[PDB]
């Protein structure tokens, strides 16, 4: 049946001159207007079928789930991850790592001390670190990145760290630097451009270094976890993992397999959560009435005394619509993470051969013009009915959908709820600039939309 149409394949180096590296998503849309929902693009002689719009995206990711459940190959990760872990693994190895991870990352999947409990504990430490800024102007980047990294640590090693902890610092930096240096609009760039490896050998050297620091950091906590292991009472990810390695015969589960899975979790759950939080505060600065209506709902449903908790979310339709609207507005991963077909598939009246790269435009869904009238305008009303009640949307897909859908989806959502309610409970946000002169436009560095730099003061309220 042949591959889908698209910007006529220029011999050798594909469509680079036709793409805007600064906003690749904007180009996929400029192409959908002229070729429809499903089209093909070239980076080299390697094709990439783009799925644009909810219909094409849901059909592929959902209805044709296992057919698209593959991950595109990346040389730098193939070296570091060795085809293991969760994010870039495939088939058997992936199937097993993902299911174990979904089972272990449930709110009450690692003992009596739940995930919510670990998040609440962290949200308390967060408020303190903000209070230590003495209400003086500051850039929240550093501390809004410490909190999510700590949530992950407690979930994995059953232990959090101090923001002044030397080791923890090197780790956050290593995790940031690696996403910052690897940051590119399309991840397949690396596999479609080998000469890039010869022009800049140092890039990969730094990546491997950080990757190995991250590995050793994780490996150390693992060796000492083995000694204190209680087979009947697993307190974290490692513990459950170390137990799966015993009386259960699985060669897929080894110490190395664990280290790589934990790196993936850190890598996938730190920067994304952090950036969303940074972007959250910024949007609350840009739209202070929203920040005030959240504070109103917080005072009314939680009060000024106790720490917020997940039960509150159901009773806080407005705050929830705010969190949904932030995730939807920022479009954290415009083009999702790259997929690939696992078998030859007939996508409608097209033919897609096993291994072909796939790219789903989440921006097309999240910003659907009909599902969200005025999709480029930030408005909590998108997730609120006429009675002020929370209103779900099939188009709310910031975490993707299908067999590959984010695995830390619950843990991230709990983080955004607890952290944002706790901050607006104890603080008022003050900007040096007035709202109309504040830039909120995203600069898509890599596969992650990052918010412009900014400072503010956290004014304690009591």
Q: What is the contact surface with ligand DMZ in residues (CB under 6 A)?
A: 77, 80, 87, 175, 178-179, 182, 207, 211, 214, 263-264, 267-268, 271-272, 337
Q: Which does 450 bind (CB under 5 to 8 A by kind): ligand HEM, ligand DMZ, none?
A: none
Q: Tell me the CB-side half-sphere exposure of residue 265, using CA atoms within 13 A.
A: 31
Q: Give how far Cα 314 sits from Cα of 309, 415, 424, Å.
A: 10, 15, 18
Radius of gyration of the chain (CA): 22
Q: Are 263 and 179 in contact (CB under 8 A)?
A: no
Q: Which two tokens stand for residue 111?
A: 């003992």
> Segment near ligand HEM (CB under 6 A), from 33-41, 164-172, 240-248, 395-403?
395-403
Q: Which two tokens stand for residue 110?
A: 């690692």
**With binding defined as CB under 6 A, does residue 268 bind ligand HEM?**
yes
Q: Are 290 and 448 in contact (CB under 8 A)?
A: no
Q: Which does 265 bind (CB under 5 to 8 A by kind): ligand DMZ, ligand HEM, none?
A: ligand HEM
Taking the C-alpha atoms of residue 352 and residue 341, their distance in angstroms, rounded to an integer, is: 8
In the complex with ligand DMZ, which residue's Cβ is closer, 37 or 72?
Answer: 72
Q: How far is the CB of 8 from ligand DMZ (least distance, A)?
A: 31
Member of 24, 51, 321, 412 binding ligand HEM (CB under 6 A): 412
Q: Which does 237 bind (CB under 5 to 8 A by kind): ligand HEM, ligand DMZ, none?
A: none
Q: Which does 267 bind (CB under 5 to 8 A by kind): ligand DMZ, ligand HEM, none?
A: ligand DMZ
Q: Are 83 and 89 in contact (CB under 8 A)?
A: yes
Residue 406 is assigned to a ligand binding site:
yes
Q: Which does 286 bind (CB under 5 to 8 A by kind): ligand DMZ, ligand HEM, none?
A: none
**With binding defined as CB under 6 A, does residue 405 bind ligand HEM?**
yes
Q: Nearest Cα to 406, choosing from 276, 270, 269, 275? A: 269
The count of residues in the chain is 462
Q: Give how far Cα 338 sits from Cα of 61, 87, 103, 105, 442, Å.
A: 12, 10, 24, 23, 21
In the complex with ligand DMZ, which residue's Cβ is closer, 218 or 414?
Answer: 218
Alpha carbon 25 to chain centroid, angstroms? 17
Q: At what angle do helices 317-330 and 288-301 cross, to 10 degrees?
A: 140
**With binding defined as CB under 6 A, does residue 406 bind ligand HEM?**
yes
In the complex with ligand DMZ, which residue's Cβ is closer, 156 or 337?
Answer: 337
Q: Which does 80 bind (CB under 5 to 8 A by kind): ligand DMZ, ligand HEM, none?
A: ligand DMZ
**With binding defined as CB under 6 A, does residue 154 bind ligand HEM?**
no
Q: Nearest Cα to 361, choosing from 67, 102, 41, 11? A: 41
**With binding defined as CB under 6 A, does residue 269 bind ligand HEM?**
yes
Helix (H) or strand (E) segment spanning residue 192: helix 189-192
> Segment near ligand HEM (CB under 6 A), from 39-47, 129-137, 331-339, 342-350?
331-339
Member of 27, 29, 336, 422 binding ligand HEM (CB under 6 A): 336
**With binding defined as CB under 6 A, does residue 207 bind ligand HEM?**
no
**With binding defined as CB under 6 A, does residue 400 bind ligand HEM?**
yes
Give ∠ CA 170-171-175 in degrees, rounded to 5. Answer: 120
For ligand HEM, the binding residues (CB under 6 A) are 86-87, 98, 152, 264-265, 268-269, 272-273, 276, 332-333, 336-337, 398-400, 404-408, 411-412
Residue set of the binding site: 406
Residue set of the binding site for heme: 406
């Amino acid at each position: 049946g042949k591959l889908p149409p698209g910007p006529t394949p220029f011999p050798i180096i594909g469509n680079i001159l036709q793409i805007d590296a600064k906003d690749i998503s904007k180009s996929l849309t400029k192409f959908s207007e002229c070729y429809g929902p499903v089209f093909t693009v070239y980076l080299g002689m390697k094709p990439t079928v783009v799925l644009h719009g909810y219909e094409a995206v849901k059909e592929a990711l959902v209805d044709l789930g296992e057919e698209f459940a593959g991950r595109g190959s990346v040389p730098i990760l193939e070296k570091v991850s060795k085809g293991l872990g969760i994010a870039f693994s495939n088939a058997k190895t992936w199937k097993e790592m993902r299911r174990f991870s979904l089972m272990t990352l449930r709110n009450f999947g690692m003992g009596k001390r739940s995930i919510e409990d670990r998040i609440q504990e962290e949200a308390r430490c967060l408020v303190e670190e903000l209070r230590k800024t003495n209400a003086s102007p500051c850039d929240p980047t550093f501390i809004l990145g410490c909190a999510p990294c700590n949530v992950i640590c407690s979930v994995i090693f059953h232990n959090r760290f101090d923001y002044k902890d030397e080791e923890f610092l090197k780790l956050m930096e290593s995790l940031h630097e690696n996403v910052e240096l690897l940051g590119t609009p399309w991840l397949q760039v690396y596999n479609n451009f080998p000469a890039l490896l010869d022009y800049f050998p140092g890039i990969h050297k730094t990546l491997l270094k950080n990757a190995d620091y991250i590995k050793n950091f994780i490996m150390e906590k693992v060796k000492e976890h083995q000694k204190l292991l209680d087979v009947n009472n697993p307190r974290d990810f490692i513990d459950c993992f170390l137990i799966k390695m015993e009386q259960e015969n699985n060669l897929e589960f080894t110490l190395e397999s664990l280290v790589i899975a934990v790196s993936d979790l850190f890598g996938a759950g730190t920067e994304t959560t952090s950036t969303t939080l940074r972007y959250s505060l910024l949007l609350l600065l840009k739209h202070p009435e929203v920040a005030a209506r959240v504070q109103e709902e917080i005072e009314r449903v939680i009060g000024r005394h106790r720490s917020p908790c997940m039960q509150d979310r159901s009773r806080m339709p407005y705050t929830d619509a705010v969190i949904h609207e932030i995730q939807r507005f920022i479009d954290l991963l415009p083009t999702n993470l790259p997929h690939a077909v696992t078998r030859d598939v007939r996508f409608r009246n097209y033919f897609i051969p096993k291994g072909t790269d796939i790219i789903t435009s989440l921006t097309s869904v999240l910003h659907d013009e009909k599902a969200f009238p005025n999709p480029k305008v930030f408005d909590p009303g998108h997730f609120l009915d006429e009675s002020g009640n929370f209103k779900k949307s099939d188009y709310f897909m910031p975490f993707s959908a299908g067999k590959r859908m984010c695995v830390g989806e619950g843990l991230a959502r709990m983080e955004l709820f607890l952290f944002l309610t706790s901050i607006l409970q104890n603080f008022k946000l003050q900007s040096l600039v007035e709202p109309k002169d504040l830039d909120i436009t995203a600069v898509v560095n890599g596969f992650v939309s990052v918010p412009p730099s900014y400072q503010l003061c956290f004014i304690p309220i009591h």
